Amino acid sequence: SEYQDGKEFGIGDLVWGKIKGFSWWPAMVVSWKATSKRQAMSGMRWVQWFGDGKFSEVSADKLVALGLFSQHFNLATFNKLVSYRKAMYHALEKARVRAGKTFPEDQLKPMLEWAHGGFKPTGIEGLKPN
């Protein structure tokens, strides 16, 4: 009954997570058992950040589906930080495999165009965990 608090987001979900002083960052919702920490408080979820693999306990109100991409993608942070560019690659690679998508900085370009364009042809349904 982990995360049975009435709030959104379950294990395996791709999300944007917001920490104070940082841009919205891509992550995956994980079970507390993967963290080596403790059970999350009601209303909170454990997430693992793409690019650095670290764990954080984040309020479900500070998470949004990764699928709301153009809405949370930060162009200024993308241009400024190589760590954000690397996080985008790992998050969009996970999204690509889940959606059954195939592509023909250079690797990132068509993945970013696919994400910004609404993850066509599956849309956001293709990012759901199996």
Author numbering: 215 to 318, 326 to 351
Task: Give me lines lifted from the publication on this model.
Our structures revealed that the overall fold of the PWWP domain consists of three motifs: a canonical β-barrel core, an insertion motif between the second and third β-strands and a C-terminal α-helix bundle. The canonical β-barrel core harbors an aromatic cage constructed by three aromatic residues, which is a signature feature of the Tudor domain “Royal family”. Taken together, similar to other members in the ‘Royal family’, PWWP domain also exhibits methyllysine histone binding ability.
DNMT3A and DNMT3B are de novo DNA methyltransferases and the loss-of-function mutations in human DNMT3B causes a developmental defect characterized by hypomethylation of pericentromeric repeats and are implicated in ICF (immunodeficiency, centromeric instability, facial anomalies) syndrome. DNMT3A had been shown to bind histone H3K36me3, but we were not able to obtain its cocrystals with H3K36me3, Nevertheless, we found a bis-tris buffer molecule in both the DNMT3A and DNMT3B structures. The bis-tris molecule resides in the conserved aromatic cage of the PWWP domains. Superposition of the DNMT3A and DNMT3B with the BRPF1 and HDGF2 complex structures shows that the bis-tris molecule is bound in the position occupied by the tri-methyl ammonium group of the methyllysine. The bis-tris molecule is bound to DNMT3A and DNMT3B in slightly different conformations. In the DNMT3B structure, the bis-tris molecule forms one hydrogen bond with the D266 residue from DNMT3B, and three more hydrogen bonds with the conserved residues G231, I233 and S237 via the conserved water molecule. The bis-tris molecule in complex with the PWWP domain of DNMT3A or DNMT3B provides a clue for designing small molecules targeting their histone binding domain. A mutation in the PWWP domain of DNMT3B diminishes its interaction with the SUMO E3 ligase PIAS1.
